[PDB]
Design a protein around this nucleic acid. Structure first.
Ligand SMILES: [Mn+2]
Ligand SMILES: [Mn+2]
Ligand SMILES: [Zn+2]
Ligand SMILES: [Zn+2]
Ligand SMILES: [Zn+2]
Ligand SMILES: [Zn+2]
Lengths: 162, 162
DNA sequence: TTGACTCTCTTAAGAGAGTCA
DNA sequence: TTGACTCTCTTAAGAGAGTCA
C-alpha cells in the first residue's frame, strides 16, 4: 500500500501541476446584495490537460501516478483529500466545489462531504446571505432564488385540506 | 385524453379516489423554531392502492384510465397538472412534494416545477425561516442544516489563493 | 510510465412503457 | 376494462476501470 509519505508526494505533485493551470478571476454573488471575487484554477478544455491528467467524461477527469511499477488513479478533485476519512454517517465522501465551477481544481475551492451536502450548496443564500454550513460557502449558490414554479398547489373539488 | 372535458374528468376521478386515501397527520419544522401540521393523503403500502392506481417502483406509482377504448397512463402525482405546460425554460416540469412525503398524493401538497427547483426545496430553511420560493414551501427542507463536512478547503504548499 | 481516448456506475429527486391475468 | 406486477430511463451533483502504443 502507498505510505503516508508517498500519498503526500502525490498530493504535492498534484498541487504543483494544478497551480500552473490558467487562473481565472470571477466576480460572484455572496448573498445580501454583496459581490466578491474567486480565483479558479481551470483545467484546459481539451488535451493536453497537464502532467498526470486525463478526461474520462465531458466534465470528469482523473489523476494517475505510477509508483513502484503500480498504476494508481484517482478522481481529479479527490486528491487533496487522500489523507482524510472517505465516508461519514455511512455516506461516501465527495469532492464538492465551493466555486460551483467543475473545471476548477483549486483546492482552496473544494471540500469533502456527502453527496447530499454537496448538492445542497447549489441553493445556499451565501456567506453574506445566511449560510449555515459549518464549512462556510464561498458564494451564493447558482440556483438560489424564488424559482420558476409553473403551477402551485390546487384542487378542483373540496376533497382535501392542507 | 385529448379533450379538456376528458382531462377535467380524469382530474376529478383522481381527486375522488385520492380523497379516500388515509389522512395521516405529520408535524413538521417550519423554520424559526416553529412547528406546523400537514395532513397527507397517503397511498397504501401494498395492493390494492385504489381505482386506477398501480405501483411501478418502490416509491413510484401510475394512474390509468380507459378513454375512447384506449388506455391512457400518467405518473400518479402528475394528474393535477394535466392542463399546465409540460416544460419551462426548456426544462421538463415535475411534480414536486412540498410535504417531502412520496406516498402523499394530496394536491394541496404538490407543485409543478423544474427538477432543479424541486430538488432545491430539500434544503430550504422553510416558511418561517426565510424561504424565498415564490410558490412558498410548506415546511423546512429535511436536509437543511450545517452539514457534516469531513474536510474543508486546504493546501500543502503556497501555489493557491481563494 | 505516460497520454488520450473508451466504457459503465452512484444518488435521490423525478419519469415512460411492457407482461400477464 | 381493471389490477398487479415487470423493466429501464432522466437529471446534475458526483465516481471506478479498460485499451493501446
Ligand atoms: Mn457541488
Ligand atoms: Mn421533491
Ligand atoms: Zn474555483
Ligand atoms: Zn452555505
Ligand atoms: Zn403530503
Ligand atoms: Zn422554500
Amino acid at each position: 500500500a502507498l505510505t503516508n509519505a508517498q500519498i503526500l508526494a502525490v498530493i504535492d505533485s498534484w498541487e504543483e501541476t494544478v497551480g500552473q493551470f490558467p487562473v481565472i478571476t470571477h466576480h460572484v454573488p455572496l448573498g445580501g446584495g454583496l459581490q466578491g471575487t474567486l480565483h479558479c484554477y481551470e483545467i484546459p478544455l481539451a488535451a493536453p490537460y497537464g502532467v498526470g491528467f486525463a478526461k474520462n467524461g465531458p466534465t470528469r477527469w482523473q489523476y494517475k501516478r505510477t509508483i513502484n511499477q503500480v498504476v494508481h488513479r484517482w478522481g481529479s478533485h479527490t486528491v487533496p483529500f487522500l489523507l482524510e476519512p472517505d465516508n461519514i454517517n455511512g455516506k461516501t465522501c465527495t469532492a464538492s466545489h465551493l466555486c460551483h465551477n467543475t473545471r476548477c481544481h483549486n483546492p482552496l475551492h473544494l471540500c469533502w462531504e456527502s453527496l447530499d451536502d454537496n448538492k445542497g450548496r447549489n441553493w445556499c443564500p451565501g456567506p453574506n446571505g445566511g449560510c449555515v454550513h459549518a464549512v462556510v460557502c464561498l458564494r451564493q449558490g447558482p440556483l438560489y432564488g424564488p424559482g420558476a414554479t409553473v403551477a402551485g398547489p390546487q384542487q378542483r373539488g373540496s376533497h382535501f385540506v392542507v
